[PDB]
Amino acid sequence: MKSVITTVVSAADAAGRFPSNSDLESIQGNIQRSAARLEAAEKLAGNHEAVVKEAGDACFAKYAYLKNPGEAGENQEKINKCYRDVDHYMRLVNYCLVVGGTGPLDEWGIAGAREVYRTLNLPTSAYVASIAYTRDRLCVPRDMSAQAGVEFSAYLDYLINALS
Amino acid sequence: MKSVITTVVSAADAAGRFPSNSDLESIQGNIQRSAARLEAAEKLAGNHEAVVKEAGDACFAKYAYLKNPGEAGENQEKINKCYRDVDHYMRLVNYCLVVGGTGPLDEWGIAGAREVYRTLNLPTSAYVASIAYTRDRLCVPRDMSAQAGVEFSAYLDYLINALS
Amino acid sequence: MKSVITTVVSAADAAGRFPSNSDLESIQGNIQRSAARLEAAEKLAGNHEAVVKEAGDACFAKYAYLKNPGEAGENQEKINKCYRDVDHYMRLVNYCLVVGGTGPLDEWGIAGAREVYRTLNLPTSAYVASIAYTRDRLCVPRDMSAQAGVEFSAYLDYLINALS
Amino acid sequence: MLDAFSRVVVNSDAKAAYVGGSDLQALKSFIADGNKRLDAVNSIVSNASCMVSDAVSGMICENPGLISPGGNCYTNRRMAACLRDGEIILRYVSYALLAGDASVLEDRCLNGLKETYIALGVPTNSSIRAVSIMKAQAVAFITNTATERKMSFAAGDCTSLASEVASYFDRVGAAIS
Amino acid sequence: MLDAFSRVVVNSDAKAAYVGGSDLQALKSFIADGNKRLDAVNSIVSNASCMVSDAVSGMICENPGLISPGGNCYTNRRMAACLRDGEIILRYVSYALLAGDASVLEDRCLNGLKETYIALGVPTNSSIRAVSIMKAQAVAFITNTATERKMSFAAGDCTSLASEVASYFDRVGAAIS
Amino acid sequence: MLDAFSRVVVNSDAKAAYVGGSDLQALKSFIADGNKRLDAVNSIVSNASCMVSDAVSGMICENPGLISPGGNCYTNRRMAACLRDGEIILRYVSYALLAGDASVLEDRCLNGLKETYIALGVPTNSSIRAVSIMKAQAVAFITNTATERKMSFAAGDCTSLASEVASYFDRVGAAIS
Amino acid sequence: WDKLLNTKPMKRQVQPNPPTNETRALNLGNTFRSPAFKFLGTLKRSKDPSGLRLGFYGRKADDFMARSIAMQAKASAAGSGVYTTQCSEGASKGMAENARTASLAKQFRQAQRSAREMSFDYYEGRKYAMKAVGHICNYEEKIFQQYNKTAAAYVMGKQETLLSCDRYAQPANKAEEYIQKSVQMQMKKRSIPYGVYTTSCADGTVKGMAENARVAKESANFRARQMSAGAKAAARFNARRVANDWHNNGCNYEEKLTSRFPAAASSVRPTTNRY
Amino acid sequence: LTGYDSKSSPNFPNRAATRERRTVSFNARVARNKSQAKKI
Ligand SMILES: C=CC1=C(C)[C@@H](Cc2[nH]c(/C=C3N=C(/C=C4/NC(=O)[C@H](C)[C@H]4CC)C(C)=C/3CCC(=O)O)c(CCC(=O)O)c2C)NC1=O
Ligand SMILES: C=CC1=C(C)[C@@H](Cc2[nH]c(/C=C3N=C(/C=C4/NC(=O)[C@H](C)[C@H]4CC)C(C)=C/3CCC(=O)O)c(CCC(=O)O)c2C)NC1=O
Ligand SMILES: C=CC1=C(C)[C@@H](Cc2[nH]c(/C=C3N=C(/C=C4\NC(=O)[C@H](C)[C@H]4CC)C(C)=C\3CCC(=O)O)c(CCC(=O)O)c2C)NC1=O
Ligand SMILES: C=CC1=C(C)[C@@H](Cc2[nH]c(/C=C3N=C(/C=C4\NC(=O)[C@H](C)[C@H]4CC)C(C)=C\3CCC(=O)O)c(CCC(=O)O)c2C)NC1=O
Ligand SMILES: C=CC1=C(C)[C@@H](Cc2[nH]c(/C=C3N=C(/C=C4\NC(=O)[C@H](C)[C@H]4CC)C(C)=C\3CCC(=O)O)c(CCC(=O)O)c2C)NC1=O
Ligand SMILES: C=CC1=C(C)[C@@H](Cc2[nH]c(/C=C3N=C(/C=C4\NC(=O)[C@H](C)[C@H]4CC)C(C)=C\3CCC(=O)O)c(CCC(=O)O)c2C)NC1=O
Ligand SMILES: C=CC1=C(C)[C@@H](Cc2[nH]c(/C=C3N=C(/C=C4\NC(=O)[C@H](C)[C@H]4CC)C(C)=C\3CCC(=O)O)c(CCC(=O)O)c2C)NC1=O
Ligand SMILES: C=CC1=C(C)[C@@H](Cc2[nH]c(/C=C3N=C(/C=C4\NC(=O)[C@H](C)[C@H]4CC)C(C)=C\3CCC(=O)O)c(CCC(=O)O)c2C)NC1=O
Ligand SMILES: C=CC1=C(C)[C@@H](Cc2[nH]c(/C=C3N=C(/C=C4\NC(=O)[C@H](C)[C@H]4CC)C(C)=C\3CCC(=O)O)c(CCC(=O)O)c2C)NC1=O
Ligand SMILES: C=CC1=C(C)[C@@H](Cc2[nH]c(/C=C3N=C(/C=C4\NC(=O)[C@H](C)[C@H]4CC)C(C)=C\3CCC(=O)O)c(CCC(=O)O)c2C)NC1=O
Ligand SMILES: C=CC1=C(C)[C@@H](Cc2[nH]c(/C=C3N=C(/C=C4\NC(=O)[C@H](C)[C@H]4CC)C(C)=C\3CCC(=O)O)c(CCC(=O)O)c2C)NC1=O
Ligand SMILES: C=CC1=C(C)[C@@H](Cc2[nH]c(/C=C3N=C(/C=C4\NC(=O)[C@H](C)[C@H]4CC)C(C)=C\3CCC(=O)O)c(CCC(=O)O)c2C)NC1=O
Ligand SMILES: CCC1=C(C)[C@@H](CC2=N/C(=C\c3[nH]c(C[C@@H]4NC(=O)C(C)=C4CC)c(C)c3CCC(=O)O)C(CCC(=O)O)=C2C)NC1=O
Ligand SMILES: CCC1=C(C)[C@@H](CC2=N/C(=C\c3[nH]c(C[C@@H]4NC(=O)C(C)=C4CC)c(C)c3CCC(=O)O)C(CCC(=O)O)=C2C)NC1=O
């Protein structure tokens, strides 16, 4: 996991040490901006079927070569698995708005992503660019609050950053 | 040093990793309660000559055996060094209200305190009990604000805890 | 004409001697040089109809006063002399790249040059304002090879020290 | 390791000074710019995988002498080891821009950084060129003067942080030259 | 004359011996830098029209007694002399760096000019000063540490061999007077 | 005399400058290898009996014409003065090493010594054979390459000052011909 | 065509559809190295030491305190005055003079490391010394990032007087020793990165020390399960004290792999000493 | 550059070959311009 609980209660154990006031201070920043963090979570829970479909053929507009046989998108059975694949990325980013850090991303959906995809001849360049479509796809005083998009947008360009 | 900067920019280096939003969250709790933390600092800066004298012979009331020759308080030259000794503890606790954690305490005035004192035949039981006099010596809606004493009092019983 | 072969036998005619073993590792110095030398020469011939224009307009992108009345570049039949006279300078460069010396420069283009530019009121540094734009325009793996760019730019160093 | 809440105390411990309210207004200005520093450093790590890729492409754009064979930086392990060292300095300056203080810059890489490079045969003129690109894109992201990428902010002056990152890569660049 | 290869002949001629296995680590040492020895000899003769023009102008603009009326650079004859009279010294070190030894620098120009500059007037203050302005600029070109023009080369160290160009001036320095 | 701190300070008089941060690290590059140099001074002075006496005993059985009638090692007026003219160059290179500079070394014993040695009838090629043997025992104390008599020192290579004692040995080789 | 003295710099024209003309400019391209100036008796050129090069006085300082760091940490092994049984450096037959030549080969092969692995091990040991100490100081890492033998004798010294090393924590079943074996295979794969075998697992020079190195470990493998019942019980709690906190941060799967299999997480050896 | 070239002007010392010559034109050919180089 990955949160501020994974920082300070682990470092006090790594020092063999009490939860001193360095550790008690670090979780106060959760409290004053969990209200900032957790109206973003029900947006992509409310749009969990809305923006998966608008990101797939926005990716498949700029990656339209896949439909030949012998590639990653040779039939609709691939595309039926492909909207599963962006949503499984989209599940975890919703959960990282709850745990604070990128907890469910790294130990489940990020580490060893660069041992899988082109071995299964899946293009990694379409994977970041489907996400980079949704990275700029926001409008901060109109969709959500202004205190909600800066947790959302910093996780989506991280998904291009973590594949780097 | 010891602060939340010593947690998250060091753990991201210990992971070989970016300052992700786990690290950016942990310092927000500094900001909302630095105003809670930093009207306590000018109290013991305003009383930096007031409560050193009231703690020495409150300790020397309950430790009045020292004035014989051959011990830790055999002359006034020891007592002239003894008000230096409580104030040098009192300097660092003032600084830990500024850095957030117990930064100037552990690397300067805490570690290896249990290799010094009774080797110099200085009683460690009088050292915690001079501090434990000042630990309960507070009045939270009257001396300072109510948001200021809980950083102060948690550092003073820590001084008995860190000598344990 | 100054070349790499004219130094060898005009010294040996002044020596009164045969071509020794000493005289022929300029010729082993020739053929190790002449492999990656002449790749620069034919590459200039596939671009030069633009290159004497694209470096030729740069002196008019530096010194706009030549198009004034009473001056050298005052009308169109005098401006096509200025593209006549700059193509003949860069026709002597690929001749200088073949022979591996400097002799075609120092007889047809440099010898007697600066005595006629004074009398015909032509600027002696507007020519080197033009082939300075030939010098920075190289990106070394793309236009040339990685070593052939420096051996082409070393003849641009000769002619700007001939007029300046 | 050390930060702006600890730089203010460490000189005062050389004179054994109680900290008062004669220097805390520098820190009251520092705790003023809490979210303002935080609205700077998120924009650095938003796109810094693009910043590593922009720098060592543009450093190769000015100099193809590395990619030539027999050069320092030309093959595929060598570029991956180049992309290693290209990230690790951007990782470190974001810590000091978080700290407000470049003590964490100094001890963790810059102790003998300069001439491990010539112990490896690494050209130090190419190093200061690449981090100058990383200087130049970093101020465009903590302002809103990128080409396409305009993050969401609230308006106001951020040049005091732009001078703080201006005092950072050159401290590396003088420690590698 | 003697080059860097003819240095080890004559003292081993003086020992009445052969070119043995002792100097093999020097006559492999000049074999290795001959790519970048020849790359360094090109760097001085490329810029030498700007180099001697900068060397007289920096000497004149800080010492205005050379533009004294009736002085050493007052007339157009005496100004066009010194543009040549300090350029041949720049030309003679361009052969001496290529040979790897300054054995040519004594028997061609340093035999005489200490007692020849005073023999028609040229003093000791600015002729020593005319070399040092060329000296800190000759180290800049071979290290690619100029201010205004960056030469596109490979990656490597140049404190070893650029050195030779300074060295070839000891010769023009002491005994320029 | 301008010693080896002061040879760069006189050029700041010539360049109208101060001593700044430019040679501030290069002035104490002289310093940290200095007790390395000061350990390498005294053992040459400890064996000042041999290094004048071997440099003529290596010119008796290497030049049999010198002890012959006509040669300059014949009479005991000359043979006593063979080492009175020989002990000068032994003490002045220890003057050169502890001062570090050589500015005073080429006028206190080199301004004059050529034009008297044409008047005393000196084979000058044999006189540089009389100092080449003297050059090859000075390495045997400062690098401890003595196959006859060692001295105890601190283990660490002092190869930067190996031929800098020998760099003045070839200046008198040109100043006698 | 004809000029006037009027001031219209300001002003524009508006007819700037101006997507029709695009323009640029340049400037740059000028590195600088600080070179020494004033000249005789001197000329210096940059040299490759491929080492610490932070002073001759600093280099001879650096091996003395790390000897004192090892002798500090030999005095926690012998806190109570025992040469404790986890440290083994031999066989049945005497052969520690033969294992002197094993360790002086390791004193020599680490000295004849090439310039990549001499310099990589300087920086990975600096961040591992940050991982080796638990606390965050003004002192300890301010030795351990300038000096590297001190960092190297701390990641060896502090870690050997806990019991999270190789061959000391005993697995319970066949299931624990097999993934203990499998994580050692990637530590072979680290020190043997490709088809060349490295110089640094060479563990021998002569025919006598070839098979002496095999029977040295098999006596030391027995002395894990021989020595105690509580110190080896303290090993399985100690094995999480190196892996959970500074080796696999963020991976819960790699965190419960330690707490379900401590002896398998004890020869994971992520201190990259090329062994 | 000054002219076309920059060559050695013949009013320098050591501007000759001076190898197996006569006695009257050795010390005329060596010591070319010592008429003022020493006399001052
Ligand atoms: C969590 C991610 C997430 C999303 C991005 C949206 C996806 C989305 N956004 C918009 C809403 C939109 N609203 C605008 C209007 C705007 N006015 C301005 O001043 C700005 C320039 C711009 C803010 C983007 C635009 C341009 C779109 C996208 C185009 C569209 O209407 O479909 C709509 C159309 C219906 C609606 O208006 O709500 C949809 C389906 N839903 C989600 O759950
Ligand atoms: C940082 C530590 C620190 C301190 C503790 C004080 C020390 C201190 N506190 C008090 C102030 C005090 N005020 C009270 C009154 C009180 N009324 C109540 O309802 C409570 C029971 C109680 C709160 C303690 C009492 C009992 C004392 C201590 C006795 C005294 O007056 O000296 C006084 C007397 C002058 C004054 O009133 O301010 C002094 C010198 N100063 C310091 O700088
Ligand atoms: C919970 C974590 C989780 C993820 C992060 C994703 C990632 C992911 N996708 C696939 C697997 C796949 N992912 C895709 C998707 C695509 N291929 C493309 O080129 C398009 C860009 C995109 C569609 C929009 C396809 C088509 C497959 C099937 C590949 C195949 O079977 O050949 C697999 C292999 C196992 C599987 O089939 O699920 C994994 C781990 N899936 C997950 O379960
Ligand atoms: C900056 C950090 C810092 C500290 C935390 C203290 C702690 C401390 N006190 C003393 C040293 C001392 N401390 C005391 C004080 C006392 N003895 C008692 O039994 C009483 C309880 C108390 C007086 C109220 C005395 C009397 C000495 C002198 C001991 C001696 O010299 O014999 C020393 C030894 C060096 C010195 O003399 O300063 C140290 C480290 N002093 C510091 O400089
Ligand atoms: C064998 C090789 C060879 C050359 C190198 C050239 C050199 C050259 N150029 C010109 C002649 C000229 N050259 C220019 C050129 C210029 N004036 C400018 O404003 C610019 C600075 C520059 C062009 C960019 C002009 C304008 C003339 C005409 C002179 C005149 O009008 O009297 C002439 C005189 C004869 C003529 O008018 O054509 C010659 C010999 N010609 C050659 O045959
Ligand atoms: C025979 C030698 C020879 C050259 C020197 C170049 C010169 C040159 N460059 C371009 C055209 C170009 N040339 C470059 C190259 C560069 N621009 C830079 O900023 C870098 C210095 C450099 C390497 C990256 C670029 C980027 C263009 C596109 C437009 C432009 O910027 O000029 C063109 C137009 C046609 C073409 O693209 O080929 C020509 C003739 N081409 C040649 O055939
Ligand atoms: C010929 C090779 C060549 C390249 C590869 C590019 C690379 C490149 N980019 C910039 C300069 C820059 N580069 C970026 C980077 C980016 N801007 C974005 O919007 C993206 C997020 C990101 C690209 C991944 C930024 C923000 C600047 C500052 C100026 C600008 O906005 O373009 C510079 C100049 C740095 C400086 O000012 O010193 C260079 C060389 N340009 C070139 O000439
Ligand atoms: C965990 C994530 C996290 C963040 C990202 C910040 C988020 C954040 N930024 C600002 C607010 C701001 N941030 C900036 C800074 C900038 N604005 C720009 O246009 C420049 C690009 C940049 C300069 C570096 C400015 C100028 C304000 C407005 C300050 C104000 O309105 O008072 C505010 C309002 C509070 C305030 O500062 O007054 C908040 C909450 N805080 C957090 O806790
Ligand atoms: C082999 C190498 C070689 C040389 C070094 C020169 C040596 C030399 N210098 C001068 C001659 C001179 N040299 C200078 C030079 C200078 N005055 C200054 O103030 C500056 C310090 C300096 C220029 C940088 C001057 C002023 C004259 C005299 C010109 C005159 O007499 O009018 C002359 C007389 C002939 C003439 O003037 O043309 C000669 C032979 N020639 C050679 O062949
Ligand atoms: C009054 C007389 C006087 C001296 C003799 C020197 C004595 C001297 N030598 C060195 C010290 C040294 N000296 C040498 C030098 C050498 N080692 C060799 O084997 C070579 C023979 C020689 C030249 C390479 C070295 C390598 C060191 C250690 C460098 C260091 O101190 O870090 C030191 C400093 C540290 C130490 O004690 O080792 C001192 C004081 N200083 C003086 O004041
Ligand atoms: C000979 C060289 C030498 C060093 C470089 C230091 C480093 C060092 N410190 C400790 C020992 C320690 N180090 C600390 C660390 C700290 N205490 C704090 O409060 C700070 C936050 C932090 C940095 C100063 C603590 C608390 C101990 C005692 C408990 C432990 O062993 O971890 C040990 C283990 C053995 C011992 O106790 O000495 C070592 C090697 N000590 C040495 O003997
Ligand atoms: C059975 C014992 C056992 C462990 C204690 C861990 C620890 C560990 N991980 C890796 C190797 C790896 N470990 C991870 C794991 C992670 N990277 C992340 O980004 C996450 C935070 C984290 C948990 C998901 C990844 C992605 C690799 C492959 C890349 C690498 O070599 O680091 C290796 C090298 C070889 C190997 O894969 O075993 C080891 C010992 N793995 C194990 O097999
Ligand atoms: C530097 C390469 C090297 C060596 C080591 C020795 C090799 C060696 N080690 C020894 C012996 C040896 N080995 C150890 C183990 C280990 N080491 C310690 O200093 C402590 C406290 C340890 C416990 C973990 C101990 C305790 C001894 C016993 C004597 C001693 O070192 O104090 C003995 C003699 C004992 C006997 O006679 O059988 C030798 C010759 N020689 C070398 O060239
Ligand atoms: C279990 C205690 C133990 C050892 C350690 C080795 C020590 C050892 N290694 C050998 C032989 C050996 N030793 C190594 C070194 C080392 N071993 C590896 O398998 C890899 C990948 C290594 C470097 C990291 C290699 C690579 C070989 C070659 C194996 C082979 O080709 O058969 C041999 C065979 C000598 C012979 O008889 O020919 C011995 C005795 N043996 C043991 O009994």
**DSSP per position, D125-157:** HHHHHHHHHHHHHHHHHHTT--SS-------S-
CB within 8 Å: B9 and D98: yes
Structure tokens at D102: 């470049």
End-to-end, the C-alpha distance of chain H in Å comes to 33
Radius of gyration of chain F from its Cα atoms, rounded to whole angstroms: 19
The answer to whether the beta carbons of residues B2 and A22 sit under 8 Å apart is yes
d(CA C145, CA C151): 10
The answer to whether the beta carbons of residues G200 and G191 sit under 8 Å apart is yes
**DSSP element (H, E) containing A150:** helix A149-162
Instruction: Find chains touching chain A: ≥3 CB pairs under 8 Å.
Output: B, D, G
The answer to whether the beta carbons of residues E49 and E38 sit under 8 Å apart is no
Provide the domain limits for residue D97. Answer: 1-177
Angle at the Cα of A16 from the Cα atoms of A13 and A22, rounded to 5 degrees: 70
d(CA A36, CA G102): 61
Structure tokens at B66: 């020292």
Helix residue spans in chain C (DSSP H): 6-15, 28-37, 39-45, 48-54, 76-87, 91-99, 105-108, 114-119, 126-130, 132-136, 148-153, 156-160
Helix residue spans in D66-123 (DSSP H): 76-99, 103-108, 117-120
Q: Tell me A99's DSSP state.
A: S
d(CA F138, CA F145): 9
The answer to whether the beta carbons of residues D66 and D72 sit under 8 Å apart is yes
Q: Is D57 in the pocket of ligand 7 (CB under 6 A)?
A: yes
Structure tokens at E66: 């050379």
Ordered domains of chain B (ranges, CATH): 1-164 (1.10.490.20)
Amino acid (1-letter code) at residue A44? L
The answer to whether the beta carbons of residues C56 and C133 sit under 8 Å apart is no
Residue F141 CA, chain-centre distance (Å), reads 14
Q: Is A51 in the pocket of ligand 1 (CB under 6 A)?
A: yes
Name the region of G53 (left: φ>0; alpha: ψ -120 to 50; beta: rest). Answer: left
d(CA G89, CA G217): 9
Structure tokens at G66: 């790390």
Structure tokens at F65: 């014409």
Report helix, strand or coil for G233.
helix
Helix residue spans in G93-163 (DSSP H): 100-109, 115-132, 141-144, 149-160
Residue G48 CA, chain-centre distance (Å), reads 22
Q: What is the CATH number of the domain that holds D139?
A: 1.10.490.20
d(CA D75, CA F105): 53
The answer to whether the beta carbons of residues C131 and C156 sit under 8 Å apart is yes
Report helix, strand or coil for A20.
coil
Amino acid (1-letter code) at residue D148? E
Query: How many domains, in total, are found in chain D?
Result: 1
Question: Which ligand lies nearest the alpha carbon of E67?
Answer: 9
d(CA G99, CA G95): 6
Report helix, strand or coil for B91.
helix
In our burial notation (b when 16+ CB lie closer than 10 A, e otherwise), range B75-89 reads: eeeebeebeebbbeb
How many other C-beta atoms are found inside a 10 Å radius of the C-beta of residue D77?
A: 7
Name every chain D residue with its beta carbon within 8 A of the beta carbon of G33: 124-125, 177
The answer to whether the beta carbons of residues E158 and E40 sit under 8 Å apart is yes
d(CA G100, CA G95): 8
Closest CA to B162 of D6, G135, D10, D17: G135
Annotation: binding site of D: 50, 61, 82, 158
Report helix, strand or coil for C30.
helix
Report helix, strand or coil for A59.
helix
Amino acid (1-letter code) at residue D3? D
d(CA F28, CA D90): 33
How many other C-beta atoms are found inside a 10 Å radius of the C-beta of residue D112?
A: 20
Question: CB within 8 A of C69, min separation 6: which ones?
Answer: none
Report helix, strand or coil for A31.
helix
Report helix, strand or coil for A138.
coil
Task: Give distance in angstroms: CA of F168 to centre of ligand 10.
Answer: 23
The answer to whether the beta carbons of residues G171 and G263 sit under 8 Å apart is yes
Q: Tell me D18's DSSP state.
A: P
Residue E27 CA, chain-centre distance (Å), reads 24
Residue F79 CA, chain-centre distance (Å), reads 22
Structure tokens at D165: 């990152």
Residue G93 CA, chain-centre distance (Å), reads 33
Instruction: Find chains touching chain E: ≥3 CB pairs under 8 Å.
Output: C, D, F, G, H
Total residues belonging to chain H: 40
Closest CA to G74 of G164, G143, G160: G160
Give G 20-79 residues with CB within 8 A of chain F: 34, 36-42, 44, 55-57, 60
Q: What is the 3-state secondary structure (H, E, C) of E30-67?
A: HHHCHHHHHHHHHHHHHHHHHHHHHHHHHHHHHCHHHH
Q: Tell me G7's DSSP state.
A: -
The answer to whether the beta carbons of residues B138 and B153 sit under 8 Å apart is yes
Residue D162 CA, chain-centre distance (Å), reads 11
Q: Is A106 in the pocket of ligand 12 (CB under 6 A)?
A: yes
Total residues belonging to chain A: 164
Determine which of D1, D2, D6 to mutate to test the interface with B (most B C-beta atoms within 10 Å): D6
Amino acid (1-letter code) at residue H9? S
Amino acid (1-letter code) at residue E123? P
Amino acid (1-letter code) at residue F117? Y
Q: Is G139 in the pocket of ligand 11 (CB under 6 A)?
A: yes
E39 vs C144, C159, C160, E139, E151, CA distance in Å? 18, 19, 19, 14, 11
User: Tokens 């021998």 label which residue?
Assistant: G204
**How many Cα neighbours within 13 Å face the side chain of G124?**
11
d(CA C20, CA C22): 5
d(CA G264, CA G134): 23
G180 vs E126, G175, G187, G217, G264, CA distance in Å? 78, 9, 11, 16, 4
Question: CB within 8 A of G140, min separation 6: which ones?
Answer: G133
The answer to whether the beta carbons of residues A110 and A162 sit under 8 Å apart is yes
The answer to whether the beta carbons of residues C34 and C100 sit under 8 Å apart is yes
The answer to whether the beta carbons of residues C143 and C125 sit under 8 Å apart is no
Structure tokens at B131: 């501090």
The strand pairing partners of F69, in sequence order, are: F71
Residue C20 CB burial class (10 angstroms; 0-12, 13-18, ≥19): exposed
How many other C-beta atoms are found inside a 10 Å radius of the C-beta of residue A6?
A: 20
The answer to whether the beta carbons of residues A41 and A98 sit under 8 Å apart is yes
Question: Which ligand lies nearest the alpha carbon of E73?
Answer: 9
d(CA G1, CA C68): 10
The answer to whether the beta carbons of residues B56 and B82 sit under 8 Å apart is yes
The answer to whether the beta carbons of residues A93 and A131 sit under 8 Å apart is no
Residue B22 CB burial class (10 angstroms; 0-12, 13-18, ≥19): buried
Structure tokens at G111: 């000295």
Which long-range contacts (C-beta less than 8 Å, at least 24 apart) are formed by E41-44?
Answer: E41/E94, E41/E97, E41/E98, E42/C150, E42/C154, E42/C157, E43/E141, E43/E142, E43/E151, E44/E90, E44/E93, E44/E94, E44/E97, E44/E138, E44/E141, E44/E142, E44/E165
The strand pairing partners of F71, in sequence order, are: F69
The answer to whether the beta carbons of residues E31 and E5 sit under 8 Å apart is no
The answer to whether the beta carbons of residues G246 and G155 sit under 8 Å apart is no
CB within 8 Å: E116 and H8: no
d(CA B5, CA B13): 12
Q: What is the 3-state secondary structure (H, E, C) of chain F?
A: CCCCCCCCHHHHHHCCCCCCCCCCCCCCCCCCCHHHHHHCCHHHHHCCCHHHHHHHHCCCCCCHHHHCECECCCCHHHHHHHHHCCHHHHHHHHHHHHHCCCCCCCCCCCCCHHHHHCCCCCCHHHHHHHHHHHHCCCHHHHCCCCCCCCCCCCCCCCHHHCCCCCCCCCCCCCCCC
The answer to whether the beta carbons of residues D100 and D30 sit under 8 Å apart is yes
Residue F39 CA, chain-centre distance (Å), reads 17
Question: CB within 8 A of G175, min separation 6: which ones?
Answer: G261
Radius of gyration of chain D from its Cα atoms, rounded to whole angstroms: 18
Name every chain D residue with its beta carbon within 8 A of the beta carbon of C146: 64-65, 67-69, 71
d(CA A22, CA A24): 6
Radius of gyration of chain H from its Cα atoms, rounded to whole angstroms: 13
Amino acid (1-letter code) at residue C38? L
**DSSP element (H, E) containing D51:** helix D48-62
The answer to whether the beta carbons of residues C140 and E152 sit under 8 Å apart is yes
d(CA D43, CA D149): 10
How many other C-beta atoms are found inside a 10 Å radius of the C-beta of residue F64?
A: 11
Structure tokens at B97: 């209200």
Name every chain B residue with its beta carbon within 8 A of the beta carbon of D2: 1
- In the structure, how many helices (H) and strands (E) does chain D have? 10, 0
Closest CA to D36 of D102, D101, D98: D98
E66 vs E61, E123, E128, F70, CA distance in Å? 9, 11, 14, 56
